[PDB]
Design a protein around this motif. Structure first.
Motif, PDB file in Angstrom:
ATOM      1  N   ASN A  39       5.434   1.377   6.296  1.00  0.00           N
ATOM      2  CA  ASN A  39       4.383   2.361   6.346  1.00  0.00           C
ATOM      3  C   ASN A  39       4.832   3.894   6.988  1.00  0.00           C
ATOM      4  OD1 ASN A  39       1.465   1.941   5.466  1.00  0.00           O
ATOM      5  ND2 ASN A  39       2.007  -0.226   6.555  1.00  0.00           N
TER       6      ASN A  39
ATOM      7  N   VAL B  10       5.910   5.092   3.283  1.00  0.00           N
ATOM      8  CA  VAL B  10       4.957   5.253   2.113  1.00  0.00           C
ATOM      9  C   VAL B  10       3.533   4.847   2.561  1.00  0.00           C
ATOM     10  CG1 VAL B  10       6.868   4.284   0.696  1.00  0.00           C
ATOM     11  CG2 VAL B  10       5.231   2.785   1.826  1.00  0.00           C
ATOM     12  N   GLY B  11       2.606   4.715   1.593  1.00  0.00           N
ATOM     13  CA  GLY B  11       1.128   4.630   1.822  1.00  0.00           C
ATOM     14  C   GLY B  11       0.889   3.017   2.231  1.00  0.00           C
TER      15      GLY B  11
ATOM     16  N   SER C 194      -1.163   4.821   9.766  1.00  0.00           N
ATOM     17  CA  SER C 194      -0.060   5.899   9.333  1.00  0.00           C
ATOM     18  C   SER C 194      -0.619   6.613   8.076  1.00  0.00           C
ATOM     19  CB  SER C 194       1.297   5.123   8.743  1.00  0.00           C
ATOM     20  OG  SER C 194       0.951   4.010   7.975  1.00  0.00           O
ATOM     21  N   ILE C 195       0.485   7.521   7.480  1.00  0.00           N
ATOM     22  CA  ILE C 195       0.179   8.024   6.505  1.00  0.00           C
ATOM     23  C   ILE C 195       1.219   7.701   5.118  1.00  0.00           C
ATOM     24  CG2 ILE C 195      -1.046  10.117   7.294  1.00  0.00           C
ATOM     25  CD1 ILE C 195       1.626  11.856   7.229  1.00  0.00           C
TER      26      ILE C 195
HETATM   27 NA    NA Z   1       1.857   4.332   5.866  1.00  0.00          NA
END
Ligand code: NA
Ligand SMILES: CCCCCCCCCCO[C@@H]1O[C@H](CO)[C@@H](O[C@H]2O[C@H](CO)[C@@H](O)[C@H](O)[C@H]2O)[C@H](O)[C@H]1O
Ligand SMILES: CCCCCCCCCCO[C@@H]1O[C@H](CO)[C@@H](O[C@H]2O[C@H](CO)[C@@H](O)[C@H](O)[C@H]2O)[C@H](O)[C@H]1O
Ligand SMILES: CCCCCCCCCCO[C@@H]1O[C@H](CO)[C@@H](O[C@H]2O[C@H](CO)[C@@H](O)[C@H](O)[C@H]2O)[C@H](O)[C@H]1O
Ligand SMILES: Cc1cc2cn([C@@H]3O[C@H](CO)[C@@H](O)[C@H]3O)c(=O)nc2[nH]1
Ligand SMILES: Cc1cc2cn([C@@H]3O[C@H](CO)[C@@H](O)[C@H]3O)c(=O)nc2[nH]1
Ligand SMILES: Cc1cc2cn([C@@H]3O[C@H](CO)[C@@H](O)[C@H]3O)c(=O)nc2[nH]1
Ligand code: NA
Ligand code: NA
Lengths: 404, 404, 404
Positions: free
Chosen positions: C148, C151-152, C182-183
């Motif tokens: 995470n 990635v998404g 997260s992003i």
């Molecule tokens: Na993420």
């Protein structure tokens, strides 16, 4: 002189024979006539006066259709596609996203209309019929070959879709080669809008039909026995527009990503190359250095083979659209390297095809949906089909350079 | 004078009766009241002082929502939608792709929000309820009629989707007519952003509900017996935005293709027409010449009927969005032909509807997904429903021209 | 001074414990180490000299990749993304649609390539492995936590998808929290292109892995017993580009709609607020006034808490992309309110996360497709997971403000 070209044609034929599944099964009538047609078609429209007039006549017609279609994109993007853009941004006034991509939408809509009216089927039936009566190839694989002159690799087999699940391995392989050796009418106008000479694009499109069959039957001879709609014209146009839209978006995203990735690769190659005293190392250098003998073999002058190898290599390791994007500046007055008119023609013909590794996955989806139990065979013959399609483009380039 | 308008209304009613499935089954209360409501609604908001104030009050509110929504597109496209665009490109500074299309996204998101809150269902329940109690029409077909004032032909039947698979042929036909006679809130703001007077768009939207039922029950009287969600408001907005995006892309691709195709057609028509001494022959001439009597019948002056026929014809043979695109320049100071204010109103009302042949395929998909075993009936009643929806738009135009 | 920050961390931990499913089941090693890692990771790269050099070194590398990727969008949009745009439109020369959105396409393609090569799996395996050996968390939930960072929320669980349908409620909840806290690498470069300091984005991304696990195991301790591809690199890039395209379109439509909707809300809030003597009432005022204590608690100065509350609140009630869009002008010289450098850092960290209510529906689709029989559990733990992810972002902000 012209002797280097004939040697080029022989080498290309030689490689196909060496990679054949059965050299003893090669039908000499089929592969002899297929090469004869492609060679004569080239001689007709590139050398013979009458043939050159028919080519420029068809090309001017195509050029008129493009301008007509441009009324659509001009309405939607207004001044962003006007002449004022050059007065303000200069060379950067040409916005690719609005100048080239919308053409894919208009031509997809047009072809969809020409299918509904029966115009497309008419031309295909004539061309595809002439091929099978002269080469001895089966009905279905010949129609798909003729269809591939105008439409893409996934759309062409649709004219013979009920015969696809039961066609022989050689037939299926030829159908794959028909698409890889050719392009589509939609992108033809796209490449034309990028500065690529329409005459070369139309020529290479027509030479793809016998060329595709030629290397398909060389590398995969027939060892088996073959066999044998929208509610209205406005719906047809709408469906075609929708398909072209999705396709325009895919190409646009691919170009942003691939070109961006190439820029990243070159950055890394500069650092890696620097470790070996070559900080100027780029992807173009690697591809050019590796494809220079191949470019020299098809008729490109020694002092232009390396630059020509950059574009031909990029077309193979990626796709022809990315190649044309890097080759288009060489067709303008602001070209970094002034190339000979023959070299410009050879590159245009050698790039004019969907023959790349990524097209296999596209063939698996499109062609595979027509015959789900045949996806195994498609993936198996994928790489060989790409090579065959590659050889067809190279052959068409050698022929084009011969009569030029 | 006003006598030509009343004759127009009679002819439009006459055609519907002649094309009826059973003239003896026509409920005089239903079709009498439906025409009465549409006529009175027109008289209310276009003639009566108080009604004109409510119309301009609602229209100004709509005009405010558009400007609010424009903050979204202004953020995304920045200076490309600013006033500086006119200082540089002049008239071409207005980029349709960034000025009009994003409105479809914002209004789809807004309507999706207004559905989640129950505001939409509230208004529909009131309007749809008043219709059935006055016309004797069934509950489901009346709610769909009222819903069609605000949303599109495929979204409107969703408020009564569990009653669609079992509704009568007359009910289903009315539901089809409800959508064809009307437009949607999303494109309303789009046409408004193109220069079309919002007052006319809102009026024609509301007059579509009784007008749609009117010609549905004339051409297809009831001969049977009728019967009888996102997790949060932010998800609703997101889903609406997504739907509007897909729709914005479809409209954009359609306009590029159709306008491009029209440009191609005119080129061919110039060559074909030249064979008969008419090299200036275009699609606009054919449509104008063929729809001039129809335009003259609904209240357009003799010297303006041909130009009015161009837009009305184009709306019928294609769609209303393409029509409005060619009619919008006639609403500016740079208009090629200055039209009377009444003629501008008549065209706006006659174009304000999804009534075209291509909408049948859209009805087959959207409405058909709600009742897959009824796709046969939809395709059967398709053409008749388009005619009925066409007559409703024409009637609304005749009424509008009467009180103007 | 620094005492207000330590109180902030305690409150954030306190809320999580109060909302726990079982406070007596909280593993002190797990939640103690998870907080220790997040706190030390913050101290390392924001305070310690060597750690600051590694951070600026990684960030400069990321900044170089962005510029490389920009060659792709520069090719497609030409002069519309050149320096001439500022000479003509000034501040409005920065077209968000062409400057920021295409980055999502390039980075999606790049990450897809880095997955095919095994580079991504390598880094994740190291980071995810170090987490489970130090926290005692299970293998699958730790790898998803590490994934995470890059990635998404819907892509991260793919590295452990065969273990998702049978993982415990605590495991599943942690996986949800890993994504919300997260992003993704794609939007990171997007926010960076909007003016957000890359150093803060990279830092908050890495601190999300232990932070996500921290509040996941606090609010949902483990009460059960846990257990335990494209054909080529060019296809990988193509698939990644395609995914990024769809995602770029979704974000663009969302921003047009949400910002437009906010503009509508403010218009209404001005009229409603006027009834209570507050005609200047806007959404920013409500959010700022309501989130000011929360902003003050995480280390924002009293005279800047209200402005900071506007962005943090908007991120929570909508998404972080809309928040960053309204916060980016405060990072330029033309900022309406000059904020302290520490306050700019706190907002950047507090916004850096997908923690919002709308992400639940996205989790239901993406993560739910991996385990369709577990969509019930996902929807049940949705709100709690958003809170947990929110607390992680707030904690990371408090820590960042502490060492700054
Ligand atoms: Na993420
Ligand atoms: C840019 C403008 C240029 C001008 C072009 C104007 C041309 C007008 C197109 C009309 O063509 C007809 O349209 C029908 C509508 O779809 C079709 O009916 C089809 O669909 C009907 C109902 O949906 C059925 O009743 C029919 O059986 C079925 O043939 C029909 O085949 C088709 O010939
Ligand atoms: C542009 C900014 C403007 C400001 C707008 C702020 C409004 C905040 C929206 C909150 O609404 C709630 O959100 C929940 C989250 O989805 C929903 O729970 C729903 O989903 C939950 C879990 O996903 C379930 O626990 C619930 O049972 C279910 O009601 C719930 O219904 C809904 O009322
Ligand atoms: C921007 C330009 C940068 C330069 C990059 C150039 C790199 C070239 C990629 C080639 O990689 C191979 O491509 C094959 C084609 O897909 C794959 O075969 C796969 O697919 C074949 C057929 O489709 C099968 O025969 C194979 O079994 C199967 O491995 C194969 O795995 C893969 O290693
Ligand atoms: C109109 C049309 C354009 C197209 C492109 N492609 C694929 O995309 C690449 C880029 O042009 C090609 O190499 C093909 O692999 C295709 O498969 N079919 C197409 N039809
Ligand atoms: C918001 C919205 C716009 C729309 C357009 N259409 C169709 O597209 C054409 C062009 O406007 C119409 O004639 C219809 O046939 C539709 O079916 N539903 C819509 N909703
Ligand atoms: C690369 C990437 C961007 C992204 C955004 N989102 C969602 O969209 C919102 C806006 O950024 C987020 O809050 C998320 O809810 C997501 O779920 N996955 C993503 N990957
Ligand atoms: Na083809
Ligand atoms: Na409607």
């Amino acid at each position: 002189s012209l002797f280097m070209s004939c040697c080029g044609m022989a080498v290309l034929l030689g490689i196909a024979v060496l990679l054949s599944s059965n050299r003893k099964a090669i039908n000499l009538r089929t592969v002899g006539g297929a090469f004869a047609i492609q060679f004569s078609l080239g001689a007709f429209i590139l050398y013979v006066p009458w043939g050159q007039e028919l080519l420029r006549g068809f090309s001017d017609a195509v050029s008129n259709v493009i301008n007509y279609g441009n009324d659509g994109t001009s309405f939607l993007f207004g001044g962003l596609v006007s002449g004022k853009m050059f007065e303000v941004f200069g060379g950067g006034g040409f916005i690719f996203a609005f100048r080239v991509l919308p053409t894919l939408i208009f031509f997809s809509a047009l072809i969809s209309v020409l299918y509904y009216l029966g115009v497309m089927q008419w031309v295909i039936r004539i061309l595809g019929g002439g091929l099978q009566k002269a080469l001895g190839t089966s009905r279905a694989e010949s129609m798909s070959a003729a269809a591939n002159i105008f439409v893409g690799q996934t759309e062409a087999p649709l004219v013979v879709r009920p015969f696809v699940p039961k066609m022989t391995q050689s037939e299926l392989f030829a159908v794959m080669c028909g698409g890889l050796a050719s392009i589509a009418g939609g992108v033809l106008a796209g490449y034309a809008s990028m500065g690529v000479k329409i005459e070369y694009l139309v020529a290479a499109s027509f030479m793809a039909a016998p060329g595709g069959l030629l290397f398909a039957k060389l590398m995969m001879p027939e060892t088996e026995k073959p066999q044998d709609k929208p509610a209205n014209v406005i719906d047809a146009a709408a469906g075609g527009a929708s398909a072209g839209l999705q396709l325009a978006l895919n190409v646009g995203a691919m170009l942003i990503a691939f070109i961006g990735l190439i820029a990243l690769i070159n950055g890394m190659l500069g650092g890696i190359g620097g470790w070996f005293g070559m900080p100027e190392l780029k992807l173009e250098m690697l591809l050019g250095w590796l494809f220079a003998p191949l470019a020299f073999l098809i008729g490109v002058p020694w002092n232009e083979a390396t630059v020509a190898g950059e574009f031909i290599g990029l077309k193979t390791v990626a796709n022809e659209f990315v190649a044309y994007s890097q080759f288009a500046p060489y067709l303008t007055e602001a070209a970094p390297v002034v190339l000979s008119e023959k070299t410009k023609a050879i590159i245009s013909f050698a790039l004019c095809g969907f023959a790349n590794l990524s097209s296999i996955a596209i063939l698996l989806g499109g062609l595979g949906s027509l015959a789900p139990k045949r996806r195994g065979d498609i993936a198996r013959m994928g790489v060989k089909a790409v090579i065959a399609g590659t050889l067809s483009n190279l052959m068409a380039a050698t022929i084009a350079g011969f009569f030029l």
